[PDB]
Design a protein around this motif. Structure first.
Motif, PDB file in Angstrom:
ATOM      1  N   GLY A 176      29.277  -5.128  31.515  1.00 51.81           N
ATOM      2  CA  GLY A 176      30.505  -5.090  32.166  1.00 51.81           C
ATOM      3  C   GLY A 176      31.244  -3.452  31.945  1.00 51.81           C
ATOM      4  O   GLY A 176      30.435  -2.744  31.522  1.00 51.81           O
ATOM      5  N   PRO A 177      32.338  -3.303  32.211  1.00 51.69           N
ATOM      6  CA  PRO A 177      33.120  -2.028  32.187  1.00 51.69           C
ATOM      7  C   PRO A 177      33.079  -1.610  30.775  1.00 51.69           C
ATOM      8  O   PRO A 177      33.083  -2.327  29.908  1.00 51.69           O
ATOM      9  CB  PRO A 177      34.215  -2.083  32.866  1.00 51.69           C
ATOM     10  N   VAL A 178      33.156  -0.304  30.381  1.00 54.83           N
ATOM     11  CA  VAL A 178      33.432   0.426  29.327  1.00 54.83           C
ATOM     12  C   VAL A 178      34.298   1.251  29.542  1.00 54.83           C
ATOM     13  O   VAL A 178      34.532   2.034  30.555  1.00 54.83           O
ATOM     14  CB  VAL A 178      31.931   1.135  28.864  1.00 54.83           C
ATOM     15  N   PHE A 179      35.506   0.896  28.574  1.00 53.45           N
ATOM     16  CA  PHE A 179      36.536   1.730  28.701  1.00 53.45           C
ATOM     17  C   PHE A 179      36.870   2.969  27.989  1.00 53.45           C
ATOM     18  O   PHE A 179      37.748   3.617  28.294  1.00 53.45           O
ATOM     19  CB  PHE A 179      37.957   0.761  28.486  1.00 53.45           C
ATOM     20  N   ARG A 180      36.292   3.042  26.726  1.00 57.42           N
ATOM     21  CA  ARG A 180      36.565   3.995  25.830  1.00 57.42           C
ATOM     22  C   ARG A 180      35.432   4.480  25.283  1.00 57.42           C
ATOM     23  O   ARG A 180      34.313   3.635  24.845  1.00 57.42           O
ATOM     24  CB  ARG A 180      37.751   3.683  24.902  1.00 57.42           C
ATOM     25  N   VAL A 181      35.344   5.816  24.835  1.00 55.11           N
ATOM     26  CA  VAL A 181      33.998   6.296  23.862  1.00 55.11           C
ATOM     27  C   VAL A 181      34.489   7.436  23.305  1.00 55.11           C
ATOM     28  O   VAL A 181      35.661   8.184  23.649  1.00 55.11           O
ATOM     29  CB  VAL A 181      32.903   6.876  24.936  1.00 55.11           C
ATOM     30  N   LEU A 182      34.051   7.747  22.054  1.00 58.43           N
ATOM     31  CA  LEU A 182      34.526   8.687  20.963  1.00 58.43           C
ATOM     32  C   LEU A 182      33.401   9.076  20.237  1.00 58.43           C
ATOM     33  O   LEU A 182      32.782   8.159  19.616  1.00 58.43           O
ATOM     34  CB  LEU A 182      35.752   8.080  20.292  1.00 58.43           C
ATOM     35  N   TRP A 183      33.238  10.405  20.128  1.00 62.79           N
ATOM     36  CA  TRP A 183      32.319  11.063  18.986  1.00 62.79           C
ATOM     37  C   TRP A 183      32.907  10.736  17.821  1.00 62.79           C
ATOM     38  O   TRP A 183      34.150  10.240  17.524  1.00 62.79           O
ATOM     39  CB  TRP A 183      32.124  12.657  19.055  1.00 62.79           C
ATOM     40  N   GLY A 184      32.132  10.889  16.710  1.00 57.71           N
ATOM     41  CA  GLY A 184      32.656  10.874  15.055  1.00 57.71           C
ATOM     42  C   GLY A 184      33.123  11.916  14.929  1.00 57.71           C
ATOM     43  O   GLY A 184      33.213  12.932  15.622  1.00 57.71           O
ATOM     44  N   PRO A 185      33.758  12.150  13.667  1.00 65.23           N
ATOM     45  CA  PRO A 185      34.604  13.180  13.278  1.00 65.23           C
ATOM     46  C   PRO A 185      33.721  14.542  13.051  1.00 65.23           C
ATOM     47  O   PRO A 185      34.210  15.548  12.995  1.00 65.23           O
ATOM     48  CB  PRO A 185      35.201  12.619  11.827  1.00 65.23           C
ATOM     49  N   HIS A 186      32.473  14.238  12.772  1.00 64.96           N
ATOM     50  CA  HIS A 186      31.505  15.312  12.559  1.00 64.96           C
ATOM     51  C   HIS A 186      30.297  15.470  13.766  1.00 64.96           C
ATOM     52  O   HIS A 186      29.829  16.571  13.689  1.00 64.96           O
ATOM     53  CB  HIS A 186      30.905  15.379  11.267  1.00 64.96           C
ATOM     54  N   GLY A 187      30.198  14.384  14.718  1.00 66.44           N
ATOM     55  CA  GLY A 187      29.453  14.773  15.687  1.00 66.44           C
ATOM     56  C   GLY A 187      28.038  14.146  15.730  1.00 66.44           C
ATOM     57  O   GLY A 187      27.264  14.955  16.315  1.00 66.44           O
ATOM     58  N   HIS A 188      27.769  13.069  15.123  1.00 66.02           N
ATOM     59  CA  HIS A 188      26.363  12.562  15.233  1.00 66.02           C
ATOM     60  C   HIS A 188      26.439  11.064  15.565  1.00 66.02           C
ATOM     61  O   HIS A 188      25.742  10.541  16.373  1.00 66.02           O
ATOM     62  CB  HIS A 188      25.505  12.756  14.016  1.00 66.02           C
ATOM     63  N   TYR A 189      27.583  10.369  15.164  1.00 67.78           N
ATOM     64  CA  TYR A 189      27.902   8.898  15.384  1.00 67.78           C
ATOM     65  C   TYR A 189      29.048   8.878  16.479  1.00 67.78           C
ATOM     66  O   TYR A 189      29.912   9.747  16.619  1.00 67.78           O
ATOM     67  CB  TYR A 189      28.335   8.274  14.342  1.00 67.78           C
ATOM     68  N   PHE A 190      28.841   7.888  17.570  1.00 66.23           N
ATOM     69  CA  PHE A 190      29.825   7.600  18.580  1.00 66.23           C
ATOM     70  C   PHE A 190      30.074   6.033  18.485  1.00 66.23           C
ATOM     71  O   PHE A 190      29.003   5.439  18.393  1.00 66.23           O
ATOM     72  CB  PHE A 190      29.663   8.363  19.829  1.00 66.23           C
ATOM     73  N   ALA A 191      31.136   5.878  18.967  1.00 69.01           N
ATOM     74  CA  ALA A 191      31.469   4.360  19.193  1.00 69.01           C
ATOM     75  C   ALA A 191      32.172   4.213  20.496  1.00 69.01           C
ATOM     76  O   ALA A 191      32.797   4.992  20.971  1.00 69.01           O
ATOM     77  CB  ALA A 191      32.605   3.562  18.071  1.00 69.01           C
ATOM     78  N   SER A 192      31.983   2.967  21.083  1.00 66.59           N
ATOM     79  CA  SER A 192      32.465   2.502  22.244  1.00 66.59           C
ATOM     80  C   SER A 192      32.686   1.044  22.464  1.00 66.59           C
ATOM     81  O   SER A 192      32.288   0.264  21.938  1.00 66.59           O
ATOM     82  CB  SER A 192      31.361   2.718  23.363  1.00 66.59           C
ATOM     83  N   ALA A 193      33.883   0.918  23.181  1.00 65.02           N
ATOM     84  CA  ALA A 193      34.488  -0.508  23.358  1.00 65.02           C
ATOM     85  C   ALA A 193      34.746  -0.676  24.816  1.00 65.02           C
ATOM     86  O   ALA A 193      34.969   0.295  25.391  1.00 65.02           O
ATOM     87  CB  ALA A 193      35.529  -0.840  22.404  1.00 65.02           C
ATOM     88  N   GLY A 194      34.825  -2.116  25.112  1.00 61.95           N
ATOM     89  CA  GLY A 194      34.965  -2.407  26.661  1.00 61.95           C
ATOM     90  C   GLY A 194      35.491  -3.581  26.869  1.00 61.95           C
ATOM     91  O   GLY A 194      36.248  -4.391  26.285  1.00 61.95           O
ATOM     92  N   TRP A 195      34.791  -4.048  28.255  1.00 57.18           N
ATOM     93  CA  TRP A 195      35.628  -5.411  28.463  1.00 57.18           C
ATOM     94  C   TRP A 195      34.956  -6.496  27.697  1.00 57.18           C
ATOM     95  O   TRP A 195      35.561  -7.648  27.733  1.00 57.18           O
ATOM     96  CB  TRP A 195      34.880  -5.517  30.044  1.00 57.18           C
ATOM     97  N   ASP A 196      33.641  -6.760  27.262  1.00 60.92           N
ATOM     98  CA  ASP A 196      33.145  -7.825  26.619  1.00 60.92           C
ATOM     99  C   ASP A 196      33.848  -8.152  25.181  1.00 60.92           C
ATOM    100  O   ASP A 196      32.817  -8.698  24.483  1.00 60.92           O
ATOM    101  CB  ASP A 196      31.731  -7.773  26.642  1.00 60.92           C
ATOM    102  N   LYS A 197      34.685  -7.644  24.630  1.00 59.20           N
ATOM    103  CA  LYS A 197      35.369  -7.744  23.446  1.00 59.20           C
ATOM    104  C   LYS A 197      34.553  -7.654  22.311  1.00 59.20           C
ATOM    105  O   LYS A 197      34.471  -8.573  21.475  1.00 59.20           O
ATOM    106  CB  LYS A 197      35.882  -9.256  23.470  1.00 59.20           C
TER     107      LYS A 197
END
Lengths: 163, 523, 121, 368
Positions: free
Chosen positions: B322-343
């Motif tokens: 489904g849709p993805v609404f947000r994305v974000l790098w980590g504070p130092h730039g190797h990990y990133f997280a994403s959240a979206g429509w499927d809870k």
């Protein structure tokens, strides 16, 4: 000559203009009118100097001391003669005498066709300046020239007050 | 009563009642001071590097010594050719070890150097201090700085004087001061410097008002309502906006031409480029920790990793449904997280094509994201019935906190720099301040109009917060009001207005200055 | 005074009053090198920056710099001292290529004429 | 088919009394009128600009910002009365005092730092205290509220104490410390910080035997370095800083009536502000005249003080000329050509330096 050359050495962002570098690399009124003209000519360059040069701060102290001395002298001469004799634009003190009228005119500005600057000039012209013919303007000129002598504050300090 | 239920449950569960870093830092500090001091300051580079390399060789880490020699040879290839070739035991090393280096310096310069080195004691200054104390001896003097045309040199040359003890002891001041043209108390002086410095701290706040700040606004024209996101690089040099036509555009905030590493595009003249390859509206963008990588997510369910050196895609991540609404790098730039429509929230690492952690527990869609400044916790928020914030653990993937109290759509999240504060905003204009450890609401700010608060930012010291809203305003808040000397909350410092330009992004620079961004709509 | 310049004297005459006023205020502010807690505080006001903008437009009339402070750009006491005597009325400048300047119609004029290209017919 | 840009118009039929019915207006058209229609106008490309939304908490009244004619300030009992004044509003009348704005701790810190910086005891402990105070003012993270007062204090001290070398040195050090703080916005105070520096660097009277000359000249060169750094740093935010500084220094330099100290300061200021290009393009052409104008009359002064002054002027001019960059007898030929161009003293020294590229650079302006 050096200033004429330098005027083209810098661009808007305070950086060298390479084109200039490469180019260099290439092989009872007439006297009043005269006084007016002189004063305008002087003050023109006086104001133009604001965007052209700096000035050392090695004279502000003397000016402050002179102004303090002049203020003290004025206050001292005061307490004697007094006892003997007993809208947006910066219009000045007179704006108080016509505050309500100016507000009403601004509210009813449509009827009045004059402009703000023209109205201010008209008010100044009509604003009051304060048996003998010629005494009035003669004394006005006298006090104006006295104020001019006072304007030479650099030299009028020693003789300001009576001995 | 919730307390009774919690107590019953808890009872039922049986709950009882190395040297190269310092060298580079010193060089970067030396080229900062005035040109007057640099002439003498440069004298410290050679002895420190020589002693560090010799110690590394003697310590048994010959590989580190070789790396240091090959790295820094280019910086001394025009001065120490013979010595550098020798370093490629002889009596030279024995003489160097026996006699400690002599370096003349001035008193004020020495004081400034000691203050600076104390300031950065744990960042690498300790190594320099130890090296100078052990293998070096500096003879302080009351003379002026030594320069080829300073008063001291001119006087010495003109009056035909004689050298001094420091001047006596391959560049030597004799060649300059001659016609042919004290010691130190390290350790103790450090204690004196620390004692003097500790006397000038501020330990209170009473009366007065909040801090004054400036603001620079970047406006975008002719968008026609097809802009969905915005972002600034960490150093404020590039700005990217994702549009509703599935492409991304990157500008240069100063107008200078952009550069590409491809030879075929050598010295091409453009100051804005495009990144094409998404097949739906783009909802998130995140510049990397200059920046060389970029992330993006769209409504087709894909996350893309771009490159800001060749301007092309590198990988695609396909873990969503489904849709993805947000994305974000980590504070130092190797990990990133994403959240979206499927809870569900997921944590990726760029080395792997699959999510390394999956975090379940929300009951509706996600609408916000954030990272803890230490890069081991993640925040999230949901909308509709379940308007609650959560705090997950990256190591285990289990929730550890929940914050409740919101009654509207949550639009933004932000974590303080000190790490003990969290701020969230909703579409009712309310801003909340949470205490992470105790999970308790500290206070509510108010004043923003209805519509949303897309972004938030914290000051460098975590004492001021700035928020931009969709009602065309920017506001500054004071987290802690001054102690009294005996519709809108009384802690709003400033509130600017824009000429019909909703604000999509606010950032706090190093100074008391911010940068904004919005889209201008005449209607 | 035997070595001097007439223009220098004229400038002194023009600026002496304002210089003395400012110097007296400053001296009253820092009496005994102790920060007096009763003098008026140093604050920024819109009127001072309005005066600075007026001076900036006057300077622009001489064609020394380019600015967009004139109202025509977007359509859709009188102190006799230089600007540096009143630091609390200055506004940092902007790059001319990044200024919000509009034409008569209402479209923003693009200043990067180097990189613009024409769409073929 | 619901994206059509044509307007939506609703018809209105009438089944009967109180039962109206609606339908979508729709008129048939010929393919000619459709295929022959003109295309709409192409909207311009996307672009961005920049302006200042607020400086130190006040909104400049420029065209970009909204007009004051058209919710931005609390008015409850608990609202501090100084916020309206801080916002810079014109309607406000109450003028807050220094007590109403700055915290007491900040006042104490400012008084302590001012007292510490102005200690004239030559004792080592007082020197260490002064150094610690300078370090604190340089690297403190919360001085955002004391910038105007620092600037005003420096200006006042330079103005009222023109007969104390120690005070001028301390103010120079404080000005150096302030600009190096990486957590302060110094853009709008560049001229304020420059004016005292220029006055100290290029004033005829400094302080009030050889030790006095050493102190005066050291102060002059320190001020020159500080001015150079300031001009290099904040020359872009302020548009006219570099031209004004260089023009003033050049105007003052081209005046033989000044003493050697003033001329040295003027040449140093020219070199610092204008940069290598300005030096090369302005000072070099007139060096031949300047030599006979000043150096030779001064060269005939046998006084040791006059000798030192002549040496200092010569060294300063040589350094200014060398700032541009920093084989057989061709080098002698170039040196002799320079002597013909620059002059006896300066030209002979330039030839003595034994540099080919520097001589090329110097002679590159001969045709001017």
């Amino acid at each position: 000559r050096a200033d004429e050359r330098l005027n083209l050495l810098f661009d808007e962002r305070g950086e060298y203009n390479l084109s200039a570098i490469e180019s260099f690399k290439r092989p009872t009124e007439d006297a009043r009118k005269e006084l007016e003209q002189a004063r305008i000519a002087t003050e023109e360059i006086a104001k133009r100097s604001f965007h052209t040069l700096f000035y050392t701060l090695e004279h502000d102290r003397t000016a402050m001391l002179e102004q303090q001395q002049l203020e003290e002298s004025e206050k001292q001469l005061q307490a004697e003669m007094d006892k003997a004799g007993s809208s947006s634009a910066n219009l000045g003190a007179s704006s108080l005498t016509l505050k309500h009228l100016i507000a009403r005119i601004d509210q009813k500005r449509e009827r009045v066709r004059a402009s703000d600057a023209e109205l201010r000039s008209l008010m100044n012209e009509v604003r009051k300046n304060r048996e003998n013919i010629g005494q009035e303007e003669l004394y006005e000129a006298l006090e104006k020239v006295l104020s001019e002598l006072k304007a030479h504050t650099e030299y009028s300090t020693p003789f300001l007050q009576r001995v | 009563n919730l307390n009774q239920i919690v107590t019953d449950y808890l009872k039922k569960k049986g709950f009882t009642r190395k040297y190269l870093k310092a060298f580079l830092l010193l060089k970067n500090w030396i080229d900062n001071n005035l040109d007057i001091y640099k002439f003498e300051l440069r004298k410290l580079l050679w002895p420190v590097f020589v002693y560090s390399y010799l110690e590394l060789v003697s310590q048994g880490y010959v590989d580190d010594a070789k790396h240091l020699l090959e790295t820094l040879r280019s910086h001394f290839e025009a001065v120490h050719q013979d010595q550098l070739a020798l370093l490629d035991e002889n009596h030279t090393t024995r003489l160097y070890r026996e006699n400690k280096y002599r370096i003349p310096l001035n008193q004020s310069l020495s004081g400034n150097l000691f203050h600076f080195l104390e300031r950065e004691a744990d960042n690498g200054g300790a190594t320099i201090i130890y090296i100078l104390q052990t293998h070096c001896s500096v003879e302080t003097s009351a003379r002026g700085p030594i320069e080829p045309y300073s008063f001291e040199a001119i006087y010495r040359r003109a009056r035909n004087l004689d050298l001094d003890e420091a001047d006596a002891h391959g560049v030597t001041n004799r060649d300059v001061l001659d016609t042919s043209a004290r010691a130190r108390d390290v350790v103790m002086e450090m204690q004196k410097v620390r004692e003097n410095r500790d006397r000038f701290v501020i330990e209170g706040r009473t009366g007065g008002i909040g801090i004054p700040v400036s603001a620079c606004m970047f406006t975008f024209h002719n968008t026609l309502g097809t802009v969905s996101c915005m972002d600034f690089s960490n150093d404020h040099k590039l700005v990217a906006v994702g549009t509703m036509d599935s492409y991304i555009r990157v500008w240069s905030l100063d107008g200078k031409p952009l550069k590409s590493a491809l030879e075929n595009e050598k010295n091409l003249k453009v100051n804005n480029r495009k990144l094409i390859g998404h097949s739906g509206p783009v909802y998130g963008v995140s510049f990397s920790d200059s920046s060389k990588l970029l992330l993006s997510c769209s409504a087709d369910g894909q996350i893309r990793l771009w490159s800001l050196e060749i301007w092309a895609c590198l990988c695609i991540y396909k873990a969503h449904d489904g849709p993805v609404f947000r994305v974000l790098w980590g504070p130092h730039g190797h990990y990133f997280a994403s959240a979206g429509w499927d809870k569900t929230v997921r944590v990726f690492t760029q080395d792997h094509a699959s999510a390394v952690r999956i975090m379940v527990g929300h009951d509706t869609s996600i609408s916000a994201l954030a990272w803890h400044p230490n890069g081991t916790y993640v925040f999230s928020a949901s909308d509709e019935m379940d308007k609650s914030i959560r705090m997950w653990s990256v190591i285990t993937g289990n929730c550890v906190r929940i914050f409740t109290g919101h009654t509207h759509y949550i639009t933004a999240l932000e974590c303080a720099h000190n790490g003990k504060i969290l701020a969230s905003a909703d579409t009712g204009g309310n801003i909340f301040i949470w205490d992470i450890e105790k999970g308790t609401l500290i206070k509510k700010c108010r004043g923003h109009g209805k519509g949303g608060i897309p972004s938030l930012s914290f000051s460098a010291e975590s004492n001021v917060l700035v928020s931009g809203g969709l009602d065309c305003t920017v506001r500054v808040w004071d987290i802690e009001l001054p102690a009294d000397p005996n519709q809108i909350t009384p802690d709003q410092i400033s509130a600017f207005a824009t000429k019909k330009t909703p604000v999509l992004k606010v950032r706090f620079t190093r100074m008391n200055l911010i940068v904004a961004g919005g889209c201008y709509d005449p209607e | 005074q035997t070595y001097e310049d007439e223009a220098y004297k004229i400038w002194k005459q023009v600026t002496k009053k304002d210089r003395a006023l400012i110097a007296k205020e400053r001296y009253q502010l820092f009496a005994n090198n102790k920060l007096n807690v009763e003098e008026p505080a140093l604050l920024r006001t819109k009127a001072g920056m309005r005066r600075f903008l007026k001076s900036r437009r006057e300077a622009e009339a001489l064609g020394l710099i380019k600015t967009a402070y004139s109202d025509s750009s977007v359509t859709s006491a009188d102190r006799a001292v230089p600007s540096y005597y009143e630091p609390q009325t200055i506004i940092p400048d902007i790059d001319p290529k990044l200024q919000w300047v509009e034409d008569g119609e209402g479209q923003v004029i693009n200043q990067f004429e180097d990189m613009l290209q024409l769409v073929p017919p | 088919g619901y994206e059509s840009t044509r307007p939506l118009r609703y018809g209105e039929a009438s089944l009967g009394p109180g039962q109206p019915l609606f339908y979508i207006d729709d008129e048939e058209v010929d393919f000619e009128k459709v295929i022959n229609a003109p295309l709409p106008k192409v909207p311009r490309d996307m672009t961005f600009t920049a302006h200042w939304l607020a400086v130190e908490g006040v909104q400049p009244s420029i065209p970009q910002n909204p007009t004051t004619a058209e919710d931005l300030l609390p008015k409850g009992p608990g609202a501090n009365p100084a916020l309206a004044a801080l916002a810079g509003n014109d309607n406000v009348s109450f003028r807050p005092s220094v007590k109403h704005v700055i915290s007491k701790e900040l006042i104490l810190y400012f008084d302590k730092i001012q007292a510490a910086i102005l200690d004239d005891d030559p004792d080592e402990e007082k020197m260490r205290l002064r150094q610690a105070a300078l370090e604190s003012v340089r690297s403190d993270p919360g001085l955002h509220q004391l910038l105007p007062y620092f600037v005003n204090f420096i200006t006042n001290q330079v103005t009222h104490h023109l007969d104390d070398l120690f005070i001028l040195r301390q103010m120079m050090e404080l000005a150096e410390a302030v600009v190096q703080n990486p957590t302060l916005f110094i853009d709008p105070y560049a001229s304020a910080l420059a004016a005292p520096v220029l006055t100290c660097l290029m004033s005829r009277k400094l302080g009030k035997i050889d030790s006095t000359l050493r102190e005066q000249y050291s102060l002059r060169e320190l001020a020159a370095s500080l001015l150079s750094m300031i001009a290099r740093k904040y020359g872009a935010s302020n548009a006219l800083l570099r031209p004004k500084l260089t023009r003033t220094c050049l105007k003052h330099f081209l005046d033989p009536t000044r003493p050697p100290a003033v001329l040295f300061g003027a040449i140093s200021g020219v070199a610092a502000s204008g940069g290598p290009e300005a030096v090369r393009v302005l000072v070099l052409p007139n060096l031949k005249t300047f030599d006979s104008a000043v150096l030779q009359p001064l060269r005939e002064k046998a006084g040791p003080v006059a000798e030192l002054e002549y040496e200092m002027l010569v060294g300063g001019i040589v350094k200014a000329v060398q700032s541009i960059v920093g084989n057989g007898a061709d080098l002698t030929r170039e040196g002799e050509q320079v002597i013909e161009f620059l002059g006896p003293i300066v030209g002979q020294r330039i030839a003595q330096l034994r540099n080919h590229t520097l001589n090329r650079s110097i002679l590159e302006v001969r045709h001017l």
